[PDB]
Symmetry: C3
Subunit: 116 residues, 3 copies
């Protein structure tokens, strides 16, 4: 999976373990091996929300399988809680998009993904 | 909604009100609350087009509802006009992708979206 | 089409011809006009994989048409080979997502695309 965090929160404000913690949380949530879990953190990004530069997050979760409205809401709340705790962003400044990826439209290590 | 602008035009060349202007223009175009409009500007990006480094833009518009061929063309032309004016990019150096987002695949403020509100 | 390369490999480590070479290779592979081929290289990105900061790539290929399991695998292997050779990333640290784009959901030069 790929977890992308777009935030105007400065890198210096973010705990050094943030990506590791998000990796672990999303490995558990998505039941996906850590080996193929990416966290792409865009901190100090030039991202504004509502026309203002108060702290905000737009995050994406790209995953083969695992995404559905029930799991999405549970994971969104858990991700929001991590962003609130670690990035000091208000819940009403967080938006998360869940992006289903087809197995045969994603390569890893010289092959597509083999899912029955 | 999320407007993402990937451009090789340098930040110093871009009007300071570009993201505000794009926010306002796309809030009106998409008829979405301004408060949930993001504009993510990647200026001075290492993006080449056609194998050359003349000014270019690849932009994306992520939105729950609102995107359809008619609205996409109208918004593309309006975005191109703003990119031409603000970034001094030629219309033939602009590509925009419109990305429909499912209501139940997008959270805001501790909840997913309501299809009927969106 | 848009080829987006997200890598923690530093810009200074990447051959000056890399984006040009990838442009040419993917113009041929996708049979799309070179004029509308973007390569958006995000080098020195803060992207970690497997909880560690060994060299990695997450790349995307956004294309109207052309993407299917057969073409995806062939292009993936060719892109992996370029990443291995030029970015010194191991094949087991490369993931590529192929993203089909609808013709009427993408503009170029004041018009949507032919469908």
């Amino acid at each position: 999976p790929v977890i992308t965090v777009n935030t105007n929160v400065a890198e210096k404000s973010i705990p050094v373990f943030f990506q590791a913690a998000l990796t672990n949380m999303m490995t558990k949530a998505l039941q996906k091996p850590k080996e193929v879990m990416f966290v792409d953190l865009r901190s100090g990004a030039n991202i504004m929300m509502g026309g203002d530069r108060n702290p905000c997050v737009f995050a994406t979760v790209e995953c083969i399988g695992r995404l559905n409205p029930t799991s999405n809401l549970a994971m969104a709340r858990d991700m929001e809680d991590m962003f609130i705790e670690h990035l000091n962003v208000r819940r009403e400044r967080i938006v998360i998009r869940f992006i289903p990826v087809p197995a045969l439209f994603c390569s890893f290590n010289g092959a597509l993904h083999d899912v029955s």
